[PDB]
């Protein structure tokens, strides 16, 4: 797994995951951006950045949030980071 | 889909009946994200293809057994799915979703 998914899990459930939240947890873990959402998110970053300053997880989270209008998961952020990497955009 | 979640949720409730403490997040995520390597997928599909003729749709049980022999431990839902998907890429009759 990616390090930030584990970080995301500690952030979301700082004192443990109670059994009443198992469905919510797994549903969130399963969630991903559609191809069209990944295109829009990467586009949004490219529109707002110069290609020198490395793009941060926070930058990507904000771009994705604006698009899906809800708190992004680590997996969603990573889809966009991957896409930006495919066009050589610097990543933090 | 619904069945994927049914299966993982059933597993989670059984493995962690009183909750998942933060010390077990590493182990939990490792299991949830565990996947067959490409070469393991190839080997599973090949063993299944050798022992079936299409008159009997490949079941979850068929795939589970094939993957178990390869990885030498109980296969997860995602590992089973990877093989079902590979089999579907050659149009092999499947009982299970993908």
Automatic annotation (TrEMBL), chain B:
InterPro entries registered for this protein in UniProt: DUF3349
The organism's place on the tree of life at top rank: Bacteria
A Pfam family annotated for this UniProt entry: DUF3349
Gene3D superfamilies to which the protein is assigned, alphabetical: 1.10.10.2390, 6.10.140.2080
Protein name per UniProt: Uncharacterized protein
Species of the source: Mycolicibacterium smegmatis (strain ATCC 700084 / mc(2)155) (Mycobacterium smegmatis)
């Amino acid at each position: 797994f990616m390090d930030n998914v584990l970080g995301w899990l500690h952030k979301g459930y700082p004192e443990g995951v109670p059994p009443k939240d198992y469905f919510a947890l797994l549903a969130l873990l399963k969630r991903s951006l559609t191809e069209d959402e990944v295109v829009r998110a990467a586009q949004a970053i490219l529109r707002s950045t110069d290609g020198q300053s490395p793009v941060t997880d926070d930058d990507i989270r904000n771009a994705v949030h604006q698009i899906i209008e809800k708190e992004p998961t680590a997996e969603e952020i990573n889809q966009v980071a991957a896409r930006l990497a495919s066009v050589g955009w610097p990543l933090a």
